C-alpha cells in the first residue's frame, strides 16, 4: 500500500530467531525485572534485577565447582563470558555464588561518582547481554557518558527450564554474540603473572 517511485512497493519481513535455538543461545526480556538467555529447548539462565537478595555470604566457590564438574558446561560458559565482559571489576565481595549440586546461582551486589562502581560495569554488561528489553529497566538515573544507574540493589543469575518468557522482546542471539568479543577487554590485573 506504500508505493515508491510509482513502481516500488515497500515490503517488510521479520526474522524468527527462535529457530536458531539448537546452535546458539537466545536472550529475551519478559518485563522490567526478568530477562532470560535460553540454551536449546531445555535449559537456560534467568537474570533478575531485584531488591531481594538470595545469597547472604561472600563466597563464590568457582574452583570447587570446576572440580565437582556437575554444572551445565554451556551455562558455565555464559557465566564466564558475562563476568569477563564487566569493565573495571575490582570489588570481589560484590559477587557471591552458589554452585552446589551443579546448579548455577550468581548474585552481583549493585549497592553503592557512580560511574566508577561495580554497579555501573555490571549493569552495562547486563545491557549488552540482555540487549533488547533491557532499556526499560535501565538508565533511570541518567549518568555521564555511557554510564547507567538503576534503583535495583542486586542482579541475580540462576539456571531455569524453558518456558515462553519473551513477552517484551523477541528472542535474539545478538547480545550474547556481541558480548563474546568483549571478554577480558577491560579486566584489571590482580597479579604480575597472569
Amino acid at each position, epitope marked *: 500500500t506504500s508505493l515508491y517511485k510509482g513502481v516500488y512497493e515497500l515490503q517488510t519481513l521479520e526474522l524468527n530467531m527462535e529457530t536458531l535455538n539448537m546452535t546458539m543461545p537466545l536472550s529475551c526480556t519478559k518485563n*522490567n525485572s526478568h530477562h532470560y538467555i535460553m540454551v536449546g529447548n531445555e535449559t537456560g539462565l534467568e537474570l*533478575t534485577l531485584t*531488591n*531481594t*537478595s538470595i*545469597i*547472604n*555470604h561472600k563466597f563464590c566457590n568457582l574452583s570447587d565447582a570446576h572440580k565437582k564438574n556437575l554444572y551445565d558446561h554451556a551455562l558455565m560458559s555464559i557465566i564466564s563470558t558475562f563476568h569477563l565482559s564487566i569493565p573495571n571489576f575490582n570489588q570481589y565481595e560484590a559477587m557471591s555464588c*552458589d554452585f552446589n549440586g551443579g546448579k548455577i546461582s550468581v548474585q552481583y551486589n549493585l549497592s553503592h561518582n557512580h560511574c566508577g562502581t561495580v554497579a555501573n560495569g555490571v549493569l552495562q554488561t547486563f545491557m549488552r547481554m540482555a540487549w533488547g528489553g533491557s532499556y526499560i529497566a535501565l538508565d533511570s538515573g541518567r549518568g555521564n557518558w555511557d554510564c547507567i544507574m538503576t534503583s535495583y*540493589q542486586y542482579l541475580i543469575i540462576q539456571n531455569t527450564t524453558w518456558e515462553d518468557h519473551c513477552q517484551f522482546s523477541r528472542p535474539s542471539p545478538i547480545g550474547y554474540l556481541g558480548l563474546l568479543s568483549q571478554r577480558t577487554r577491560d579486566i584489571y590485573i590482580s597479579r604480575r603473572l597472569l
Partner: antibody
Amino acid sequence: QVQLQESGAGLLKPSETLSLSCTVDGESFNGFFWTWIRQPPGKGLEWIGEINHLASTGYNPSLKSRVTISVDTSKNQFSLKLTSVTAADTAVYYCARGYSYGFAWPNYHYLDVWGKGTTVTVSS
Amino acid sequence: EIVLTQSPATLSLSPGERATLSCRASQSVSSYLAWYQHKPGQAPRLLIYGASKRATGIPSRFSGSGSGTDFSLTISSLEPEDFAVYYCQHRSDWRTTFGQGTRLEI
C-alpha cells in the same frame, strides 16, 4: 493449601539447647524465606531469623551467637537450634513462610502461612 | 536498622466504630509494611501486605495506606471478632522487624 508442621520438645532446663523443626507440605520450597518467630509471654512478636533453599540465613543480632538455622531441601524442612537457653527464651515459637517481592516498587514482604506454634519453657 | 513504633499502645472502641492504627518507621522503608492480627491461643494471621493489599480471606473492612515513614491500618466497621492485637512488620535485606503491637479492645 499449605501446611507447616512444627516438632520439637518444649520442656527444657537452663543451659540446654532448643531444637525445633518445621516441615512444609504444599507448594514450592524455593523462593520463600522460611522464618522462625517467637512471642515471649506478655510481649510482642520477635523475629528469630530466616533461611532460604540455598542455606543463606539471616539472624536477629541479639541472638546471633546462640542461634543456628538450617535447611534440608530433600524433605522440605528447616530447623532452629538455640544453645544455652536461659529464662529469657521462654516463649511460643512459630515457623512461617515469608515471601519478599523486590522486582518493582513498592517492595513488600509478608508471612502468609504460619505453623500452630510450640510453647517452650525453661525452668529448674 | 529500621524500627517500627506503633500508635497508640491500646485502643478502646465500640463495635461498628472506625479503627485507625499507625506505624512509624525510624527511616524511609526498604519495603512497604505488612499488618497481622493475633489472638491468644492461635497463630498470627496476615491481614495486609504492601501497605494496602488484603491477604487471602481477609474481609473488605480491612484497609491500609501509607508511605515513607508513616503507615496506617483501618477497620471501617469493626466486628466483635476484630478485637485482637495488631502488628506492623518491615523487612530490609535479610532482617525482619516487628512493631511492638497495638491492643484493640471493647
